[PDB]
Design a protein around this ligand. Sequence first.
Ligand SMILES: O=C(O)c1cc(C2CCCCC2)c(OCC(F)(F)F)nc1C(F)(F)F
Length: 130
Amino acid sequence: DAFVGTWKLVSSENFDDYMKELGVGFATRKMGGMAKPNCIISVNGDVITIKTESTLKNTEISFILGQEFDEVTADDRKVKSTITLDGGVLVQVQKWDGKSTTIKRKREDDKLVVECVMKGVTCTRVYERA
Ligand SMILES: O=C(O)c1cc(C2CCCCC2)c(OCC(F)(F)F)nc1C(F)(F)F
């Protein structure tokens, strides 16, 4: 849809703090911080796929809006994830060990803006079309 495409990371703010609040250790944070991923979003019928590709780490999720699914995150959390579309924003929550984090994806001008929240930390990542 508005989201379909191949997107390249162009800016990131507070990602290290976000990962630290998730409990990610130094080595994985190091990898994550200097990753410049592509994000490839596609849709086929009810099923949306989001691939995140980078030199040292790839991930992929496929889901139906509103249907919880199991996910292994890039930092190796085993979470229960649910993604919904609200006012044009793809809102993902991940739940594990009584914690949650939200990842909101929205389209703004030429950007795919990703806002990641864990407790008091807010990270903003901006992707542009490849
Ligand atoms: O899409 C993103 O840019 C993104 C990317 C990553 C990984 C992707 C592979 C390379 C390293 C970074 C990620 O990892 C999960 C955690 F941050 F927790 F490590 N979380 C997100 C985001 F939160 F924003 F969805």
